[PDB]
Ligand binder design. Structure first.
Ligand code: FPS
Ligand code: FPS
Ligand code: IPE
Ligand code: IPE
Ligand code: MG
Ligand code: MG
Lengths: 202, 327, 327, 202
C-alpha cells in the first residue's frame, strides 16, 4: 500500500501544474563519461508517474539507440519498484518510450521526401500536393504529438540534431547534468514549462 | 530611416572585440528579434513605436556585426503565424516594411559602396503585391554584391521552407531531372531559401523565451543556441558579445559533433551505395568482388551519375528562381 | 658424414658479405639441388658418388647461409616422381638418407650447441618404415630448437602438399571444427607442411633448368626465382652470393607487389563479408545501415566467430600432427 | 593470296620445331608504363599462327583483366590483317585466349577447396576422396592443359601469382620487354622451349 501512496503523490504533482507536457524529450549532451542509465531510467519513470504520455530519449552519438535493452531493463526495473504481469509493463513502456538518435531527425525528413518523390514518379501524386501537413503525416512521427518540452542535460548549448521538424514550438529547458538527478530538480523543470506562455504568433 | 548605422566601436568594445577575435569567430549569426511589444508596454509607448525601435536596433546590430567581422546575418522579421495578429498590427508591420524597403532603394549606391547583399526569404506570395515588388527590387539590385549578406526572413516559417524544398525536388523527378533515390540531406540543403549561405554558427533569441518558433529548424540543428532575457529593442553590443562568448565556449565540442555527424552520414551513405551495387550484382549473376573491380566501377558510376543529375537539377532550379525574381 | 660444415668465410667472402648485408637480406632461401647425375657423368664417377657429393655441398651451403645470417633453408631432396627411377638409384638414395639421418642422431647435442631444428616435409608414408623412424627421431629430437631451421623436402611434391592441406580443412568441417566458408588463402597456408616457416625469399634451382618441378608452388608465388647453370655438386659461395644479389635487385618491386597483393586480398575479403552481412540483413527485413550500427556489429561477429573456429581447428590439427610424430 | 603465304610460313615455322607448346602463358611484369596492347596482341596472334592452341595473358595488377575488350579488339584487328565472318573469328579467340590475374591462382584453389569442403558437409564426399587428380579437376582449368611454356616479360624475377598449381613443370623463359617485341625474338623463345629436355623425375 506504500507504493499506492507514492503513485498518488506523483499523480497529484503532475495534476497540480498549470500544464503538463504530453510528450517530453530528454537530450543528453554530456560526452565525458558514458551516460548513467539508471539516472535516465529514473527521469523516464518520473515522467510516466506524473502523467506524461510519451518520452523520447536522445543522444547525438547514438549510445542509447545502441543500448536499447540496457535502458529498457533499467526502466522496467525502477518502474516495477515504484509500481510495486511483465508483458503488459513491457508493452506500456514500449508504447510510451522512444529511443532516438540523429537519423530520426534530418535523415527521416529525407526518407519522407524520397517516399513522396517516389509517388510523383508513379503519377500517384503531384509536387503541389505536398503542403506542410502532408509532410508532417509522412514523417516517422505519424500520429504522435510533437515534443512540447525538452530537458537538455549537459554543457552543450545545442539540440545536436533532435527532431528538427518537431521542435518548432518545443520549450527547451537546460539542466547541467543528468548524473544523480533529483526529483526536485526534475519537477522544477516541469514548473518552468508550466509557467511558460505560448502565444503561437499572436 | 536607413538599414545600417554608421558608427565605430568605443574603446572597451574595441578592446574586447580584439580579445575574442583571437579565438574562433562566428561566420554567420541568426537573430530572432523577439520582445518588441513587451518593450512597448514597458516604456508606455504604442506597439508600432516598439516595432519601429526594433528595426533601428537591427540596423545598429548589423553595424556591430560588421565591426566584429561577422559578415552574414539572418533575422526573423515576420512569421506566417504573425498574419494571425490584428489587422491594425499587421498593417502597421507591412507599412514599416514598405517604408524601409523604399528607403533602401533610395539609399542604393550606398549599398554598392559597402557591397551589402539583401536576401528576403519566405513564402513571399502571402505579402501584398506592392510590398513584393519593393522586396524584389531590393533583392534584384543587391544581387552580385559580396562584401556582406543580410537575410531577412519575412512571411517565413521553417516548416514551410522545408516543405517547399521537398516540393522543389519532387518537381525535379517530375521533370525528369532527378531520380527519387537522388534525394539526400545535402540536396535538401540546396533547395532551402537559405541555400546561398552556410548554416548559422549562432542562433540568438531575445526576450527570455526558450523556443524557436519555426525558425531555421533544419539550419540550426548544430548551431549554438543563445536565449537572452533582454527585450530586442534593448539589445546592446554586450548582449551580442555575451552570445559570441557562448559560441566560443561551445566551439570545440560543437565542431567535433558537427564533424562526427558529417563523417557518420557519409559513412552510412557509402554502406547504402555498396549495398545497392551488391543487390544489382547479386541479380545479373555477377561476382560481388574480384580482380576486375566490377563493384568499384559500378560504385563510381552510381555516384557520378547521381552527381550529374543533381548538378543538372540545381542549374534548372536556379534558372527557375531567377525567372520569378526577374518578373 | 655430418649435416653442417664448420668453416669461417675467407676475406673476400667476408668482405662481400658485409657489403650486401647493408641491404635487404633474405630470411629464408629454398634450394632445388639439381644436376647431381650430370655432374657424376662429367667427372666420370658413379651416380651414387654424384649424389654423395651433393649432400656434402648441402652441408657446405648451410654453413654459408649461417655465416650470411640466413637462418632458414628449405631443400628439395627427393620428389615423389623420383620414385620412378631405377631400384638401383632409389635404393642408393634411400641408403644415403638412412646414413645421414643416422649420423645426425649420433651427432646430436652438437645440434643443441647450435639450436638447429630439422624438419622433414613430404608424404613420408611412401618411404621405407625404417627410414621413417630415423626421420621421426631426428624431427622429434630437434623440436624446440630455434637458432636456425632446415626443412628437408623428402618424398615431397607441391601438389601433394596442397592436396593434403585441403584434406586437412575438409577434415575440419567433417569434425565440426570449421565451416566451408572459413576456408581461405591464409588458412591453407597454415595447413601446408611448411606452415611453421615464412614463404621463401629466394628460390634457387641449379643445372640450368628453368622449371620448378612441383616444388613450393604455393610458397614461391612471390619469391625471387634464380636459375643458375652450375651443377649442384659444384655450387660455390659465389653462386649463392649472385643469387642473393638478384634478390636485392628485385626486393623493392617484389615487396611492393607482395604488399599490393596482400592489401588487395584483404580489401576483397572485406567486400565479400560486407555483402554477406548485407544479404542476411536484406532477409530478416532489417536496415542495411543506421545509427544502431547493426551491420558493423554483424561484421565484427562474422569475423570474430570465423577466427574462433579457425583457432580451434588449428589447435586440433596441431594435436593430431604431434600425435603421429610421437608414435 | 599474299596472306595465304604468310599463313603457310607461320605454320611451317611451328611445325619445324622439335616441339611446340600446346598452352602458352604470357606474364607481363613491367610496371613502368601501361603495357602495349598491340605488342601483346601480336604475341597472341603469332601463337595462333604457329599452332599454339591456348594463350593465357597475365599481369599481377589485373590491368589486362580490367581491359579485356581493348585487348581482344587489338587481337581481332591484327588476326584479321594476318588472316585477310567476325563472329567465328571472335569465338575462336575466346576459345583460345584467356586473360588472367592473381585471383585465377591461389584464390581459385581456395574456391575449389570451399566447393569440396561443402560436399563433405553434405555427406556427399569424404576428405580422403580428394587426391591430386580430383583437386585438379575441381580447378577452373577444367579440361584445358596446363601451360608448358611461359614467356616472362620485364625485369622481375618472379611469377607473381601465375597459376601456382598449373606451373609445376612449365618452362619459364624470360625476355627483357614486351615493348616492340620482334617475331624473331618470339620465335627464339620457342626454339629455347623446343630444345629443353623434360625428364619428369626419371
Ligand atoms: C525587416 C523590416 C524592415 C521590418 C521587420 C523587423 C521589425 C521592425 C519587426 C519584426 C516584427 C516582429 C513581430 C518581431 C517579433 S517581436 P513581438 O511582436 O512578438 O513582441 P512580443 O514578443 O509579443 O513582446
Ligand atoms: C637429405 C639427404 C640426407 C639426402 C638427399 C639429398 C641428396 C644427397 C640428393 C638429392 C637427390 C636428388 C634426385 C637430387 C636431384 S639431382 P638429379 O638426380 O636429378 O641429377 P640430374 O639432374 O639428372 O643431373
Ligand atoms: C518575427 C518573429 C521574431 C516571429 C517569432 O516570434 P513570435 O513572437 O511570433 O513567436 P511566439 O512567441 O508567438 O511563439
Ligand atoms: C630432389 C629434386 C631436386 C627433384 C627435382 O629435380 P628433378 O630432376 O627430379 O626434376 P625434373 O628435371 O626431372 O623435372
Ligand atoms: Mg514574440
Ligand atoms: Mg634433375
Amino acid at each position: 500500500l506504500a507504493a499506492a501512496h507514492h503513485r498518488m503523490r506523483w499523480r497529484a504533482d503532475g495534476r497540480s501544474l498549470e500544464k503538463l507536457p504530453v510528450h517530453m524529450g530528454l537530450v543528453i549532451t554530456e560526452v565525458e563519461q558514458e551516460p548513467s542509465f539508471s539516472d535516465i531510467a529514473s527521469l523516464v519513470v518520473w515522467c510516466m508517474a506524473v502523467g506524461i504520455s510519451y518520452i523520447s530519449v536522445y543522444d547525438h552519438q547514438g549510445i542509447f539507440k545502441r543500448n536499447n535493452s540496457r535502458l529498457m531493463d533499467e526502466i522496467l526495473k525502477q518502474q516495477q519498484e515504484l509500481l510495486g504481469d511483465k508483458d503488459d509493463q513491457v508493452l506500456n513502456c514500449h508504447l510510451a518510450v522512444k529511443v532516438l538518435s540523429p537519423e530520426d531527425g534530418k535523415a527521416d525528413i529525407v526518407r519522407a521526401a524520397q517516399d513522396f518523390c517516389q509517388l510523383v514518379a508513379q503519377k500517384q501524386k503531384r509536387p503541389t500536393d505536398l503542403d506542410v501537413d502532408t509532410l508532417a503525416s509522412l514523417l516517422s512521427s505519424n500520429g504522435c504529438p510533437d515534443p512540447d518540452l525538452v530537458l537538455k542535460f549537459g554543457p552543450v548549448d545545442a539540440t545536436l540534431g533532435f527532431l528538427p521538424w518537431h521542435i518548432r514550438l518545443t520549450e527547451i529547458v537546460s539542466l547541467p547534468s543528468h548524473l544523480n538527478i533529483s526529483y526536485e530538480d526534475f519537477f522544477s523543470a516541469l514548473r518552468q514549462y508550466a509557467a511558460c506562455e505560448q502565444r503561437l504568433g499572436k | 530611416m536607413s538599414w545600417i548605422k554608421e558608427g565605430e566601436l568605443s574603446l572597451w568594445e574595441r578592446f574586447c572585440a580584439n580579445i575574442i577575435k583571437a579565438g574562433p569567430m562566428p561566420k554567420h549569426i541568426a537573430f530572432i528579434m523577439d520582445g518588441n511589444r513587451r518593450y512597448a508596454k514597458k516604456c508606455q509607448v504604442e506597439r508600432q513605436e516598439g516595432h519601429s525601435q526594433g528595426f533601428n536596433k537591427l540596423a545598429e546590430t548589423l553595424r556591430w556585426c560588421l565591426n566584429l567581422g561577422i559578415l552574414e546575418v539572418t533575422v526573423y522579421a515576420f512569421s506566417i503565424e504573425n498574419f494571425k495578429r490584428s489587422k491594425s498590427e499587421v498593417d502597421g508591420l507591412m507599412d514599416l516594411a514598405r517604408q524601409k524597403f523604399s528607403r533602401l532603394m533610395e539609399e542604393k549606391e550606398k549599398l554598392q559602396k559597402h557591397g551589402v547583399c539583401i536576401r528576403v526569404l519566405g513564402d513571399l506570395h502571402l505579402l501584398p503585391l506592392d510590398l513584393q515588388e519593393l522586396i524584389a527590387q531590393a533583392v534584384q539590385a543587391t544581387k552580385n554584391y559580396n562584401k556582406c549578406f543580410l537575410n531577412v526572413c519575412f512571411a517565413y516559417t521553417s516548416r514551410h521552407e522545408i516543405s517547399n524544398a521537398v516540393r522543389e525536388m519532387a518537381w525535379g523527378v517530375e521533370q525528369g531531372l532527378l531520380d527519387p533515390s537522388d534525394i539526400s540531406e545535402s540536396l535538401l540543403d540546396k533547395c532551402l531559401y537559405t541555400n546561398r549561405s552556410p548554416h548559422p554558427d549562432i542562433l540568438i533569441r531575445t526576450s527570455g523565451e526558450v523556443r524557436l518558433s519555426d525558425f531555421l529548424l533544419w539550419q540550426t540543428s548544430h548551431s549554438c543556441l543563445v536565449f537572452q532575457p533582454v527585450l530586442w529593442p534593448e539589445y546592446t553590443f554586450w548582449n551580442l558579445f555575451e552570445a559570441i562568448l557562448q559560441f566560443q565556449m561551445n566551439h570545440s565540442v560543437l565542431q567535433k559533433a558537427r564533424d562526427m555527424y558529417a563523417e557518420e552520414r557519409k559513412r552510412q551513405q557509402l554502406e547504402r551505395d555498396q549495398a545497392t551495387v551488391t543487390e544489382q550484382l547479386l541479380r545479373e549473376g555477377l561476382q560481388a568482388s574480384g580482380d576486375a573491380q566490377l563493384r568499384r566501377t559500378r560504385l563510381h558510376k552510381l555516384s557520378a551519375r547521381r552527381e550529374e543529375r543533381v548538378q543538372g537539377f540545381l542549374q534548372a532550379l536556379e534558372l527557375k528562381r531567377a525567372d520569378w525574381l526577374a518578373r
